């Protein structure tokens, strides 16, 4: 095979990110064997130098001439850094005089945390490295490819980023899932604008057999790594649930934490004065050991104990607690009165291996082709797809026929709930976060106040002017139930302040503060990489930042809104709204599954203010007013306290992680 494809890509120039190892290294190799010129770029110079050296030796053996000039490298290329990526483009053009293929292969695993534990810096890094980087490179290379009359951009997404019309939950990996869904969503929504010269496709392999998946150089396998992650999160969630259950029935949080601080399972189960939830917690922990590990004798490690106090703090559970209300956040690891010894594992290796085989067996059992593709198999597929000249706007699936069955599909709304469900809002507080969507914010506030008899709507805006514009659309009697909170630092701080001032909300509606830009690849005024980064911040990160507080609130429902497009607009805003709809759906689906594993059990659903077909968008005022009213009905449908469809498996499923378009 590898010596007999010299004609497939002869003379084509490829820039491949993350080209030192894995799929990227194999694509670099096979493109060179197929007669292409390759600029391989990566962070690590040693891996890159060895990989290129091996390719050049193979090129010599199959009798290429001038092999050194055919494969070039650029090290210390960090995809999270724009200057560093620009150097990769400049190096490719300096070496080869053009770029034919851009392979957006580089990726990071990301935070590997539940959303409620995930840092904003970790989320931002995953989105910058995996998704914004790809737009940065497209921005710089697309004009070169259009000017020469041809090009190919390929995004290396993942099967776990979902597929068109069908989101997939990726618990503990929401930042990664969003970044991968985003790579694909760019192909679906932007290929129109890269044509006619540039083909723009994605690949979405699932698990891929090679050194990184198997584990090499004394490193655990990716199934083993998720197994360990799963047990840590099960212990955190279990300790957290016991603390919350105790606080709900009126145990002081200071008393719960003083009892957990003793961090002794045998003493905790036996002690009579410990709350039943802590006794039962400690009993269950004491049964989980193997004779080596320590998680049967200690409830908590410093790291899990830090994650626990963070969740309690962010739920507002320290607001009236003398000590904790004021303790430095820097000290969240340091409150245990004894900690597991460092000479022994916390977690049992047997349960790690068992969870890893649940993970591996689960994916391996859903492969139509019976075995995981290797990195070479996925690289071979990639090099074959790159030779096609007729496909654009598609995601190829070189996954081994991976089929994970799920019903998380975007729905058009035409349905309603009983007034009895709405009556449960009477006397409650709701938060609406927004700025630019005045008609939608106003009608939703009116529906909650006038139709559902909510006592207080807290409208959390970017500016006082944004508050006044919504208030000006309400009757005076309705407006007396509208409270203003203008963001002063960040949305999480504004949410902490709203909770402190007016209490626990029953419904949170998250809308973007800013309208989408009306531009993408136009030569006159394109959407710059910094502008695209802000679109991601305002339309994805924003919802994450709201969600990571909202998911900690008992009896609260969370509603995420994707973008609107002004009536009559004919710009790429409509493509950008559909990009966000797809990418945010990965988040919604993932968060809905995580939240069911938390004691707070917060439902999350998504409402879309843009339809899939631009001719079906509202085109006159009657259709606009129809959409505004439908939007408020959709918010009440997924925002009102969820019905007793705990009886029905079917109905329970259709109020968590839905994406509904109005």
Ligand X SMILES: CC(C)(COP(=O)(O)OP(=O)(O)OC[C@H]1O[C@@H](n2cnc3c(N)ncnc32)[C@H](O)[C@@H]1OP(=O)(O)O)[C@@H](O)C(=O)NCCC(=O)NCCS
Q: Tokens 């925002």 identify what position? A: 639
Binding site annotation covers 244?
A: no
Residue from 397, 455, 537, 599 touching a second copy (CB under 8 A): that is 397
Q: Determine which residue in the list 25, 36, 171, 182 makes contact with ligand X, applying CB under 6 A.
A: 171
Q: Which stretch binds a second copy (CB under 8 A): 290-298, 443-451, 602-610, 625-633?
A: 625-633
Q: Is 43 annotated as a binding residue?
A: yes
Work out whether 212 is an interface residue with ligand X (CB under 6 A): no
| Cβ atoms 13, 39 nearer than 8 A | yes
Return the residue of 206, 348, 512, 517 that touches ligand X, per CB under 6 A. Answer: 206
> Which positions ≥6 away from 276 have C-beta within 8 Å?
none
Question: CB-based contacts of 352: which residues, under 8 Å, 6+ apart?
Answer: 224, 227, 228, 231
- Residue 612 as a binder of a second copy (CB under 8 A): the answer is yes
Least Å from the CB of residue 208 to a second copy: 9
Q: Rounded to a whole number, what is the distance in angstroms from the first to the last CA of the chain?
A: 52
**Sites for ligand X among residues 128-167 (CB under 6 A):** 158, 160
- Please tell me whether 18 is known to bind a ligand: yes
What residue has token string 């790594």? 225
H helices within 262-348, ranges in order?
Answer: 265-270, 276-286, 302-314
233 contacts ligand X (rule: CB under 6 A): yes
Q: Least distance from C-beta 105 to ligand X, angstroms?
A: 14
Asked if 597 touches ligand X (CB under 6 A), the answer is: yes
105 is in an annotated binding site: yes
Residue 65, burial from CB neighbour count under 10 angstroms (0-12, 13-18, 19+): exposed
Residue 504 interacts, among ligand X, a second copy, none and using kind-specific CB cut-offs from 5 to 8 Å, with none
Position among 94, 164, 248, 338 found at the interface with a second copy (CB under 8 A): 164
Task: Classify residue 217 as left (phi > 0), alpha (psi -120 to 50) or beta.
Answer: left
How far apart (Å, rounded) are the C-alpha atoms in residues 148 and 140?
A: 14
Q: Looking at 106-114, 297-305, 338-346, 396-404, which segment touches a second copy (CB under 8 A)?
A: 396-404
Which CB, 123 or 170, lies closer to ligand X? 170
Among 3, 290, 320, 334, interactor with a second copy by CB under 8 A: 3
| Cβ contact 542:510 at 8 Å | yes
Under rule CB under 6 A, residue 237 binds ligand X: yes
CA 481 to centroid of chain Cα atoms: 35
User: The sheet that has 71-74: what strands, in order across it?
Assistant: 71-74, 37-41, 13-16, 101-104, 151-156, 198-203, 395-396
Token digits for 649?
Answer: 């498996």
Q: Which does 264 bind (CB under 5 to 8 A by kind): ligand X, a second copy, none?
A: none
Calculate the alpha carbon distances from 400 to 226, 378, 396, 492, 508 in Å. Answer: 21, 9, 12, 42, 41
| Number of alpha helices (DSSP H) and beta strands (DSSP E) in the chain | 24, 15
Q: Tell me whether residue 120 is annotated as binding.
A: no
> Residues 93, 238, 321, 384: which binds a second copy (CB under 8 A)?
384
10 contacts a second copy (rule: CB under 8 A): yes
172 or 578, CB closer to ligand X?
172
Encode burial over 207-218: b for 16+ CB neighbours within 10 A, e otherwise.
bbbbebbeeeee
Q: Residues, the chain, total?
A: 662
Dist. CA 219–CA 454, nearest whole Å: 54
Determine, following the binding rule CB under 6 A, whether residue 298 of this chain makes contact with ligand X. Answer: no
Min dist. Cβ of residue 430 to a second copy (A): 22
Q: Is 237 annotated as a binding residue?
A: yes
Residue 166 contact, options ligand X, a second copy, none, Cβ 5-8 Å cut-off depending on partner type: a second copy
Q: With beta carbons less than 8 A apart as the criterion, state whether 524 and 498 touch.
A: no
234 annotated ligand binder? yes
| Residue 63 zone, left/alpha/beta (φ > 0; ψ -120 to 50; rest) | left
What minimum distance in Å lies between the beta carbon of 398 and a second copy?
4
Smaller CB separation from a second copy, 319 or 387: 387
Reading the block at residue 166, the tokens are: 């069908």
Catalytic residue among 135, 176, 298, 553: 176
Q: Residues with Cβ < 8 Å from 251, sequence gap 6 or more?
A: 275
DSSP character at residue 402 = B
Binding of a second copy by 405 (CB under 8 A): yes
Residue 218 partner contact from a second copy, ligand X, none using kind-dependent CB cut-offs of 5 to 8 Å: none
Residue 295 in the binding site for ligand X (CB under 6 A) = no
Among candidate residues 357, 249, 348, the one with its CA nearest the CA of residue 298: 348
Taking CB under 8 A as the rule, does residue 310 contact a second copy?
A: no
Instruction: Say how far apart CA 496 and CA 546 lie, in whole Å.
Output: 11
- The answer to whether 416 contacts a second copy (rule: CB under 8 A) is yes
Q: Is 212 annotated as a binding residue?
A: yes
Instruction: Examine residue 230 and tell whether it contacts ligand X (CB under 6 A).
Output: yes
Task: Please choose which of a second copy, ligand X, none residue 363 contacts, taking the beta carbon within 5 to 8 angstroms, the exact cut-off set by kind.
Answer: ligand X
Contact of residue 377 among ligand X, a second copy, none (CB under 5-8 Å per partner type): a second copy
318 binding partner (options ligand X, a second copy, none; Cβ < 5 to 8 Å by kind): none
Alpha helices per DSSP H over 159-297: 174-194, 211-214, 222-248, 253-261, 265-270, 276-286
Establish whether 650 is a catalytic residue: no
Interaction partner, residue 611 (a second copy, ligand X, none; CB < 5-8 Å by kind): a second copy
Report what 612 binds from a second copy, ligand X, none; CB cut-off 5-8 Å by kind: a second copy
Nearer to ligand X, 95 or 359 (CB): 359
Q: How many positions of this chain bind ligand X (CB under 6 A)?
A: 20
The alpha carbon of residue 502 and the mean position of all alpha carbons in its chain are separated, in whole angstroms, by: 30
Closer by beta carbon to a second copy, 426 or else 619: 619
354 binds a second copy (CB under 8 A): no
Q: Is residue 234 part of the contact set for ligand X (CB under 6 A)? A: yes
170 binds, among ligand X, a second copy, none (CB under 5 to 8 A by kind): ligand X
> Is 20 marked as a binding-site residue?
yes
Q: Which whole-number Å values give the CA distances from 626 to 14, 412, 629, 662, in the listed order?
A: 50, 14, 5, 9
**Of 105, 118, 155, which is closest to residue 579 (Cα–Cα)?**
155
Judged by CB under 6 A, the chain residues 321 through 380 that form the site for ligand X are: 355, 358-359, 362-363
Q: Which of residues 632-661 bind a second copy (CB under 8 A)?
A: 648-651, 653-654
Cis? peptide before 330, omega within 30° of 0: no
Coil/strand/helix, residue 493: helix
Binding residues for CoA: 114, 158, 170, 172, 226, 234, 237, 358, 597
Catalytic residues: 176
Binding residues: 18, 20-21, 23, 43-44, 78-79, 105, 114, 158, 170, 172, 176, 180, 208, 212, 226, 234, 237, 358, 597
Binding residues for NADP(+): 18, 20-21, 23, 43-44, 78-79, 105, 176, 180, 208, 212
């Amino acid at each position: 095979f590898s010596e007999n494809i010299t004609g497939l890509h002869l003379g084509k120039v490829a820039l491949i990110t993350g080209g030192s190892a894995g799929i990227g290294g194999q694509v670099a190799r096979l493109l060179a064997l197929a007669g292409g010129k390759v600029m391989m770029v990566a962070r690590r110079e040693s891996e890159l130098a060895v990989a290129r050296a091996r390719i050049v030796s193979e090129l010599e053996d199959i009798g290429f001439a001038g092999v050194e000039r055919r494969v070039q490298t650029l090290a210390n290329v960090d995809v999270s850094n724009f200057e560093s990526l620009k150097g990769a483009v400049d190096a490719t053009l300096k070496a080869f005089g053009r770029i034919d293929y851009l392979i957006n292969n580089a990726g990071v695993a990301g935070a590997e945390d539940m959303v409620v534990d995930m840092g904003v810096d970790a989320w931002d890094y995953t989105l910058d490295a995996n998704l914004v980087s790809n737009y940065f490179l497209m921005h710089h290379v697309a004009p070169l490819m259009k000017a020469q009359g041809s090009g190919y951009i390929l995004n290396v997404s993942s099967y776990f980023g979902g597929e068109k019309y069908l989101a997939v939950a990726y618990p503990n990996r929401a930042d990664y899932a969003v970044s991968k869904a985003g790579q694909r969503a760019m192909v679906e929504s932007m290929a129109r604008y890269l044509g006619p010269e540039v083909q723009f496709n994605a690949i979405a392999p699932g698990p891929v057999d090679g050194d990184r998946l198997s584990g090499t150089g004394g490193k655990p396998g990716l199934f083993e790594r998720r197994g360990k992650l799963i047990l840590e999160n099960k212990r955190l969630n279990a300790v957290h649930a016991a603390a919350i259950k105790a606080i709900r029935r009126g145990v002081r949080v200071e008393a719960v934490l003083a009892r957990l601080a003793r961090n002794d399972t045998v003493k905790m189960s036996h002690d009579t004065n410990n709350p039943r939830e802590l006794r039962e917690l400690a009993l269950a922990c004491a049964r989980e050991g193997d004779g080596t590990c320590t998680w049967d004798q200690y409830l908590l490690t410093p790291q899990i104990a830090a994650a626990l106090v963070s969740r309690l703090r962010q739920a507002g559970l320290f607001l009236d607690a003398p000590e904790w209300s004021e303790r430095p956040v820097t000290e969240d690891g340091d409150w245990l009165l004894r900690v597991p010894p460092e000479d022994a594992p916390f977690l049992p290796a047997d349960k790690i291996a068992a969870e890893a085989k649940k993970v591996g067996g689960g994916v391996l059992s859903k492969l139509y082709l019976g075995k995981m593709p290797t990195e070479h198999d996925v690289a071979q597929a990639t090099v074959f797809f790159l030779a096609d000249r007729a496909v654009s706007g598609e995601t190829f699936m070189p996954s081994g026929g991976l089929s994970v069955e799920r019903s998380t599909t975007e729905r058009e709304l035409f349905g309603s709930p009983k007034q009895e469900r709405l009556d449960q809002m009477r006397g409650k507080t709701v938060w609406i976060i927004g700025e630019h969507l005045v008609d939608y914010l106003a009608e939703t506030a009116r529906a909650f106040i006038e139709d559902c008899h909510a006592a207080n709507v807290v409208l959390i805006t970017r500016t006082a002017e944004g508050f006044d514009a919504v208030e000006a659309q309400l009757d005076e009697d309705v407006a007396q139930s509208l409270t203003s909170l203008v963001v002063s630092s960040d949305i999480e701080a504004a949410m902490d302040e709203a909770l402190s001032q007016w209490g626990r909300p029953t419904t949170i509606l998250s809308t973007p503060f800013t309208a989408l830009p009306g531009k993408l690849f136009e030569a006159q005024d394109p959407l710059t990489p910094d502008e695209f980064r802000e679109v991601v911040a305002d339309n994805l990160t924003h919802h994450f930042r709201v969600s990571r507080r909202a998911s900690l609130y008992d009896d609260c429902q969370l509603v995420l809104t994707s973008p609107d497009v002004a009536m009559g607009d004919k710009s790429p805003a409509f493509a950008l709204a559909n990009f966000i709809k797809t990418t945010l759906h990965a988040f919604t689906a993932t968060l809905a599954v995580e939240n069911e594993r938390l004691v707070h059990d917060v439902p999350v659903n998504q409402i879309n203010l843009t339809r899939r077909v631009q001719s079906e968008e509202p085109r006159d005022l009657d259709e606009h007013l129809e959409e505004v009213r439908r939007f408020a009905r959709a918010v009440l449908l997924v925002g009102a306290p969820l019905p007793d469809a705990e009886d029905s498996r079917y109905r329970a499923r259709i109020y968590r992680g839905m994406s509904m378009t109005v």
